[PDB]
Amino acid sequence: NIIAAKAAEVRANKVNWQSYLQGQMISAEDCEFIQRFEMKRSSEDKQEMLQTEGSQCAKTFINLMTHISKEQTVQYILTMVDDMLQENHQRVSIFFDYAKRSKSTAWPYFLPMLNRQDPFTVHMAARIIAKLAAWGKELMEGSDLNYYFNWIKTQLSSQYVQCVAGCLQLMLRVNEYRFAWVEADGVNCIMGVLSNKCGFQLQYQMIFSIWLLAFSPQMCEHLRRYNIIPVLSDILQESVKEKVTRIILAAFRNFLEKSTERETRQEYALAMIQCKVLKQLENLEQQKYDDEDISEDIKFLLEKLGESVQDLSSFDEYSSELKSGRLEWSPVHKSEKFWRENAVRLNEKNYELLKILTKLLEVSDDPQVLAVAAHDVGEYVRHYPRGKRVIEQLGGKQLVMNHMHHEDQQVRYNALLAVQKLMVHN
Amino acid sequence: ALSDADVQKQIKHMMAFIEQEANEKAEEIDAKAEEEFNIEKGRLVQTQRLKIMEYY
Amino acid sequence: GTEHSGSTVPSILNRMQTNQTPPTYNKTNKFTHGFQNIVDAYGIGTYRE
Amino acid sequence: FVNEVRRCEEMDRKLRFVEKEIRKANIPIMDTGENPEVPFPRDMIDLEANFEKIENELKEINTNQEALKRNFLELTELKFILRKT
Numbered sequence: 001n002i003i004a005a006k007a008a009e010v011r012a013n014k015v016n017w018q019s020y021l022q023g024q025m026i027s028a029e030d031c032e033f034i035q036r037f038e039m040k041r042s043s044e045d046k047q048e049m050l051q052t053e054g055s056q057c058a059k060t061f062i063n064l065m066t067h068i069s070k071e072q073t074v075q076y077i078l079t080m081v082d083d084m085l086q087e088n089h090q091r092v093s094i095f096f097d098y099a100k101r102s103k104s105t106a107w108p109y110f111l112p113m114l115n116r117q118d119p120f121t122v123h124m125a126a127r128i129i130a131k132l133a134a135w136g137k138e139l140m141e142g143s144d145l146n147y148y149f150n151w152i153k154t155q156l157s158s159q160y161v162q163c164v165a166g167c168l169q170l171m172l173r174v175n176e177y178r179f180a181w182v183e184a185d186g187v188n189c190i191m192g193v194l195s196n197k198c199g200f201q202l203q204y205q206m207i208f209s210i211w212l213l214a215f216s217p218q219m220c221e222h223l224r225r226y227n228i229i230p231v232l233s234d235i236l237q238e239s240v241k242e243k244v245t246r247i248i249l250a251a252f253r254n255f256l257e258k259s260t261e262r263e264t265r266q267e268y269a270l271a272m273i274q275c276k277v278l279k280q281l282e283n284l285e286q287q288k289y290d291d292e293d294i295s296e297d298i299k300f301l302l303e304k305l306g307e308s309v310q311d312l313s314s315f316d317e318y319s320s321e322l323k324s325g326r327l328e329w330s331p332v333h334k335s336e337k338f339w340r341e342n343a344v345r346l347n348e349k350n351y352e353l354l355k356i357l358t359k360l361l362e363v364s365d366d367p368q369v370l371a372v373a374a375h376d377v378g379e380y381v382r383h384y385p386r387g388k389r390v391i392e393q394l395g396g397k398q399l400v401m402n403h404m405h406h407e408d409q410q411v412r413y414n415a416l417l418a419v420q421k422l423m424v425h426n
Numbered sequence: 427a428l429s430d431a432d433v434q435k436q437i438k439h440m441m442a443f444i445e446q447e448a449n450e451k452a453e454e455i456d457a458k459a460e461e462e463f464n465i466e467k468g469r470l471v472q473t474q475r476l477k478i479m480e481y482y
Numbered sequence: 483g484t485e486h487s488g489s490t491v492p493s494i495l496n497r498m499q500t501n502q503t504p505p506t507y508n509k510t511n512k513f514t515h516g517f518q519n520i521v522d523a524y525g526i527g528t529y530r531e
Numbered sequence: 532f533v534n535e536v537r538r539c540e541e542m543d544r545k546l547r548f549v550e551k552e553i554r555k556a557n558i559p560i561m562d563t564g565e566n567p568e569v570p571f572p573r574d575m576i577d578l579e580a581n582f583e584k585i586e587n588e589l590k591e592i593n594t595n596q597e598a599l600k601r602n603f604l605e606l607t608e609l610k611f612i613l614r615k616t
Contacts, residue, residue: 173460240573243450286534420595423602432494
């Protein structure tokens, strides 16, 4: 609230620009524009600003902003100019104040500027930097803004930081420069500031910038390498602030609807493995809201996540990983439909899968892969009492009895479950 | 004051709430409008690029 | 409560008057509860009685 | 807001299930104290879902050991039939 408080504080202060309209101390000419268009609610004034032709508007006011430069003198002049530059609802709109003769009005004047990031100076600089997205003027050099400390030193220190980030998120709209910033290490900085703990408003701004960046399919594909989806689902679990849940849901929706390449969408299975976001949706569906976006997106995500888990439920990659011996806890293992209809696929040539899992159980000592294999074998033998006789003939029951007494009581418990499924009719 | 000051505080917080909420809503509508913009522009580029390629 | 879950909640409270009768109440202790129970066994009377 | 109360009733049913189970087991209750311990997250719903999963696998262990004893009831019979000539 610091910046709004300052703005309200110095809104009421009326400077004596008339004492030097074209007079003493402060210059002597640039009050011919100020005296015009004092009525900001006037259609005539906002349409006759073009009569200025830019000659004074943002041509001499530019470098007047540096003419005055006192913590009292230029704080009042600063706001009396930049509050008009800030309101700007339709007064300039698409760069009406043009100033074609000199480029410094458009951009290169702020190199000495970007100093004292506290008395609103960096704030005016950021606001005039915020003249690209909804304003018709193409930035001359992206690196003249992306690599300056106006945001870097404000990352760590807070309403001034919030306002800076607000200008940044207002500007991050069109991909032609968001790409330029993504090529930089800015993604790492966004991730680090995200991991940093701070106010929930700032966290919202960060996820909001992430949502804006989610527009780009190919650059999302490039930035797949970072673990943004689970860090975002984690902060979703850690915080419920309504708008934050909506924006995170919209970001996941953006990923799912862009989907550059199904091959590069390995995160489809991660979205449940890393944390079951469906379990959160199971509760969030019960809470209804007036916003059609929330309901439509949660329904659409429920359907798509159903498709994702159903497609993930398969035997080909399953048997591939079971052969390779890397048994992670995939949710397909517990999928009942696999053992209701697809159970006979485990019966390969000479029960190759079952025998090699017996061999891998004998070989590996890792409790979690042992548990996974034992549970799969138990759920398979649960339905085929003929394969139960085959397994008993093989002698894997003795292997499970040996693994029952074990350092990991979880493996012991799972081994008891498996031996019990064998104790069915036996 | 205390009661009147509390009333003023309540009014200020309500104004802040509407401000933040519907400001974010407005930008959400504008972002949907940007997606909108790019989709329609892409369809247009396809339709025109067709005839361009035959003529050339 | 607000500093337990801080989100800029002033928890404002206003006083207003009306005609609805407030409900009676009388603080007791370990050696007047029996008598309060016996007296309220025959109902509880009007306000400020 | 009735959904929260319905979920609480489900929670109560599961807690009664474990309560009657531990009363059949006759395990003395501790009750150390700690009456003022109420927390205020929203995440404990997941934890109590996990404990209801613990109660579900408990129901499994009961419905399973009953089968085990039934199997033994005929195992001993087979042993007795074997003892004779």
